[PDB]
Amino acid sequence: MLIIGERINGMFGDIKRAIQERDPAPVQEWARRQEEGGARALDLNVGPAVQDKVSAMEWLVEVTQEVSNLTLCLDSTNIKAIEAGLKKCKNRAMINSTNAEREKVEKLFPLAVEHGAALIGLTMNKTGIPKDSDTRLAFAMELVAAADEFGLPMEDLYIDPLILPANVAQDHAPEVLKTLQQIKMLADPAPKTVLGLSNVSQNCQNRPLINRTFLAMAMACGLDAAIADACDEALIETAATAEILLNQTVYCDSFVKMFKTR
Amino acid sequence: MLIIGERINGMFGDIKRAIQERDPAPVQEWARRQEEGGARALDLNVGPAVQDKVSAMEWLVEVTQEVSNLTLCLDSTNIKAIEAGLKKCKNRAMINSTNAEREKVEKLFPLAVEHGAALIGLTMNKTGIPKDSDTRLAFAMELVAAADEFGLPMEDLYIDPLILPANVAQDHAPEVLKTLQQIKMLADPAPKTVLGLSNVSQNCQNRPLINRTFLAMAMACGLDAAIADACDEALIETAATAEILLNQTVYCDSFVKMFKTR
Ligand SMILES: CN1c2c(nc(N)[nH]c2=O)NC[C@@H]1CNc1ccc(C(=O)N[C@@H](CCC(=O)O)C(=O)O)cc1
Numbered sequence: 001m002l003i004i005g006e007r008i009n010g011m012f013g014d015i016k017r018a019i020q021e022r023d024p025a026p027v028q029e030w031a032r033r034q035e036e037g038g039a040r041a042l043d044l045n046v047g048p049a050v051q052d053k054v055s056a057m058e059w060l061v062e063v064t065q066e067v068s069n070l071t072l073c074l075d076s077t078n079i080k081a082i083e084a085g086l087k088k089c090k091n092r093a094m095i096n097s098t099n100a101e102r103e104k105v106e107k108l109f110p111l112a113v114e115h116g117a118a119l120i121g122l123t124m125n126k127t128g129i130p131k132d133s134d135t136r137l138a139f140a141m142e143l144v145a146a147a148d149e150f151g152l153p154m155e156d157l158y159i160d161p162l163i164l165p166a167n168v169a170q171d172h173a174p175e176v177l178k179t180l181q182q183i184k185m186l187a188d189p190a191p192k193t194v195l196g197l198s199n200v201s202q203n204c205q206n207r208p209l210i211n212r213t214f215l216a217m218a219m220a221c222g223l224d225a226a227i228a229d230a231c232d233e234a235l236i237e238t239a240a241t242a243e244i245l246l247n248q249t250v251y252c253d254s255f256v257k258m259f260k261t262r
Numbered sequence: 263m264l265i266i267g268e269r270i271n272g273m274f275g276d277i278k279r280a281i282q283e284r285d286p287a288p289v290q291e292w293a294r295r296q297e298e299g300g301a302r303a304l305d306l307n308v309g310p311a312v313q314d315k316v317s318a319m320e321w322l323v324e325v326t327q328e329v330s331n332l333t334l335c336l337d338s339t340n341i342k343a344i345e346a347g348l349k350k351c352k353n354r355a356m357i358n359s360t361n362a363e364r365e366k367v368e369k370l371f372p373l374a375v376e377h378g379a380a381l382i383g384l385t386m387n388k389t390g391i392p393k394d395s396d397t398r399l400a401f402a403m404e405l406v407a408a409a410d411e412f413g414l415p416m417e418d419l420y421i422d423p424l425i426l427p428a429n430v431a432q433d434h435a436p437e438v439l440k441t442l443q444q445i446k447m448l449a450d451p452a453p454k455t456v457l458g459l460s461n462v463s464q465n466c467q468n469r470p471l472i473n474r475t476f477l478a479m480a481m482a483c484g485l486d487a488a489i490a491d492a493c494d495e496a497l498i499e500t501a502a503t504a505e506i507l508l509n510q511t512v513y514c515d516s517f518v519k520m521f522k523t524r
């Protein structure tokens with residue numbers, strides 16, 4: 001399980017301010033804390049508030065890689081910002097993300113291949129987020145075909161079935177799990193999967209509990225990565241424990257500590 | 263998710279003592295504690311120490327139902343002990359258990375049907391516990407077939423893939439999850455599934471964490487019941503949260519208390 005730190009996101013007050021005033025401190029500290037927690041990748045989202053998002057993404061990348069060697073997951077719907085971000089990265093990055101819209105596919109897949117970056121693909125298009133796991137799957141298969149079309153190593157494709165809040169879109173959770181299990185059955189080389197975990201507990205009571213439980217359930221269905229709270233110690237324990245239970249990582253008494261220091 | 267309290271088991275020092283000295287107190291206190299924790303069924307095992315195991319089972323049933331209206335899960339390999347127990351039960355019971363051995367099947371299935379009791383079926387026979395999910399599923403199918411043969415309503419059949427310790431039999435864990443998943447894809451009305459959860463963490467470190475993480479994973483694979491620690495609050499939290507994430511129970515802020523006081 002690859003945990004992608006979610007905290008360096010412009011939606012958070014401290015990050016929004018850091019970006020606006022160009023204060024590196026808050027960002028670099030979150031990069032450190034998330035890595036200490038067990039994250040092996042960092043999501044970088046500039047947020048919708050800043051004016052020049054292209055310039056903001058470059059800044060997030062520069063100040064982050066100064067204190068971290070972790071993989072950078074450039075999170076933005078602005079392709080110019082993604083491209084500008086990729087050019088600043090000193091290490092392999094992740095593009096977050098592309099959807100099944102052909103227009104975006106033929107721009108982001110070649111871009112990912114060009115930079116040898118991983119690519120996250122959302123199971124949806126202009127038509128919206130589908131509920132049925134079969135519709136989600138069809139979009140997943142469109143991304144898979146695209147990976148073969150543009151020469152992207154299937155192992156560099158992370159399909160995101162898009163999890164929603166369990167309190168107002170509860171019937172989506174089981175559909176997401178089913179979509180993951182289906183993608184898991186694909187023949188080798190099979191694509192990977194990822195989720196914006198925290199979205200499942202938005203506005204719910206005891207979000208950490210809900211996040212933890214869904215992560216474990218999702219991993220049983222093949223989940224490979226999760227954009228989540230890397231500073232949540234109980235979440236990290238779950239990830240570590242789940243690997244053991246799927247026999248992905250050999251058991252030893254200090255399996256949690258080994259997960260955080262691998 | 264049906265939690266079957268595991269604590270009333272002769273392997274535990276206090277229960278062994280209570281049975282041998284015929285002291286109702288310890289047993290009745292555990293019955294109340296487990297129900298308060300959220301269990302809706304109580305496993306009753308006399309343990310191997312006591313000499314007269316048939317009268318010990320009748321005694322456990324008598325002292326337990328005296329303070330509890332919960333379904334009693336009679337845990338014993340001695341058919342006579344099971345029969346004497348069922349005869350003492352004032353409420354519907356559960357038999358734990360029968361295996362895939364035909365000799366066991368033709369005695370236990372008709373027994374469960376005669377008493378209108380539920381029946382737990384282990385995916386194993388005299389050749390042992392199979393590691394591969396293919397063979398586990400094969401025995402599961404024999405159990406489903408026997409249920410139709412002897413007239414046991416399918417929802418009264420709980421198939422147990424038999425989970426083993428994650429530190430010495432780690433490769434069994436994923437095979438169990440796969441079995442559960444395939445069991446749910448046999449035919450509706452499909453049979454139910456159950457596990458002796460605590461076995462997965464035997465001799466491991468961070469036992470509660472391993473137990474609850476696996477429960478969540480198993481529920482995503484269809485687990486319907488579990489013989490576990492009904493007094494472990496974190497375990498109950500997971501059970502309650504999993505139901506929500508599988509859309510089996512409508513979400514509300516008090517979903518945990520709601521599960522317990524259900
Ligand atoms: C849509 N999510 C998502 C994605 N990328 C992919 N591929 N998939 C996804 O589902 N990128 C962004 C987001 C994942 N990251 C996050 C980050 C924070 C919170 C969150 O819970 N935020 C707080 C905001 C706190 C504050 O603003 O002060 C919240 O309560 O909403 C949720 C998801």
Ligand SMILES: CN1c2c(nc(N)[nH]c2=O)NC[C@@H]1CNc1ccc(C(=O)N[C@@H](CCC(=O)O)C(=O)O)cc1
Binds near residue numbers: 382460
């Ligand atoms: C084999 N398990 C099992 C079953 N029935 C079915 N159908 N399936 C099962 O897997 N019945 C008994 C047991 C389930 N109950 C239990 C009860 C306790 C412990 C346990 O962890 N015991 C302690 C012993 C503690 C003591 O002796 O004081 C241990 O660490 O082994 C595990 C499973």
Ligand SMILES: [Ca+2]
Binds near residue numbers: 224
């Ligand atoms: Ca996978």
Ligand SMILES: [Ca+2]
Binds near residue numbers: 446454
């Ligand atoms: Ca089920």
